[PDB]
Structure 1
């Protein structure tokens, strides 16, 4: 249940985002593959409109939790795969402490054999010379644990978690995330007991790529039950 079966091998992934942060318009395309059996994601994103007006790490959480590795004993709490292939809607508000906020709306679903994440991102109230529009964030990412809770009312899940981005001066730029997911289908889905997803993310660059981009490798495992 139910995308369960859809995820037993390596699945191609496509990500497309249209963004507007303080009027700075930009688009990003990402490609790669996920192997949920190992909770592994490998992806390369390209800013297709010239330079990315925000730091790449600020976009990682926005750029497919159905690739998390759910231990066999926890399969019944895997809301993400259960919503497939029809997919789910994912919305967030990300408040950057002492700075602006991003509001995103994405749909994650299969297109044939490819798992697609299409997102619209809107950012407002950013400080022109703050850590974001001013690009003062280091190109790295910290590991973390986010707590997935069922949202029985909408038959989806909700998550509230903090991401800390390292600032070049040694300090931290907090990004408080509030997320809610609901199934696209009318299809049944599995509602989970509370548990965590533990993620680790490594960012890198493609020595041969001249466009603004980001190479991302992640491993994610569910636990807490």
Structure 2
């Protein structure tokens, strides 16, 4: 295996939401075989961010997912050359984002070149008013569409005052190496949480646990 039980993560995100430019750096560690990762995120430019930090967090690597022997692990077989993804996020009030990640590996470290573009968020809505609390736990449906591995998520952010703000994500995943074999259809369960933050979310500790399964217990 190219992938060790303990891997480092290095990340830089550049992006723009509703006109607002920002740069965020990440440093972390994870256990690819246990499906667990944590990282320290630091806003380097454009802080304090004028929108809910939560919209960014699923952009901050499906290599960190526990895959059973009976599902093909496209992500771990992508290394060492790596893979990219592209994602469209569609929010219920017309907010739309496009995100991408190019993931590479050097020794014990995943490098992530992340881009995040958001537009059409209403000024009075929960994202620009900073009313989000968290992502609910989600299930990603993985399947092949016109020869491309595709993940669909139908999920929600919990808001202040017992309300939910619905989001649909579609992600396409592509290995850099031609002829990494596509998996069969399956599921990946996700739990993402902010573990700590400072006053304006200039520094955030992020955690994700993910487990691949076939729909049975």
TM-score under structure 1 length normalisation: 0.88
Structure-2 residue corresponding to 1:45: 41
Q: Could you tell me which runs of 5 or more consecutive residues in structure 1 were left unpaired when the two chains were aligned.
A: none
The answer to whether the 8 Å contact 2:4/2:108 transfers is no
Given candidates 66, 69, 72, the residue that maps to 2:69 is 72
Given candidates 141, 150, 153, the residue that maps to 1:147 is 141
Structure-2 residue corresponding to 1:94: 89
Structure-2 residue corresponding to 1:192: 183
Find the aligned partners of 2:185 and 2:157 in 1 and give their Cα distance: 26
Given candidates 191, 195, 210, the residue that maps to 1:220 is 210
> Alignment length, in residue pairs?
214
Find the aligned partners of 2:114 and 2:197 in 1 and give their Cα distance: 24
* 3-state SS of paired residue (2:135): coil
Q: How much does 1:10 deviate?
A: 0.2
Structure-2 residue corresponding to 1:59: 56
Higher strand share: 2
Find the aligned partners of 1:53 and 1:100 in 2 and give their Cα distance: 15
The answer to whether the 8 Å contact 1:78/1:190 transfers is no
Structure-1 residue corresponding to 2:151: 159
Moved over 2 A (4+): 150-153
The answer to whether the 8 Å contact 1:56/1:214 transfers is no
Find the aligned partners of 2:138 and 2:170 in 1 and give their Cα distance: 15
TM-score under structure 2 length normalisation: 0.91
Q: Could you tell me which runs of 5 or more consecutive residues in structure 2 were left unpaired when the two chains were aligned.
A: none
Higher helix share: 1
Find the aligned partners of 1:210 and 1:53 in 2 and give their Cα distance: 9
Find the aligned partners of 1:198 and 1:28 in 2 and give their Cα distance: 26
**Alignment RMSD (CA, Å):** 1.9
Given candidates 140, 157, 160, the residue that maps to 1:168 is 160
Q: C-alpha offsets along residues 22-52 of structure 1, whole Å, 9 cap, x if unaligned?
A: 1101111111111012111111111112212
Q: C-alpha offsets along residues 154-188 of structure 1, whole Å, 9 cap, x if unaligned?
A: xx4111212210111211111110111112233x3
Given candidates 74, 78, 82, the residue that maps to 1:83 is 78
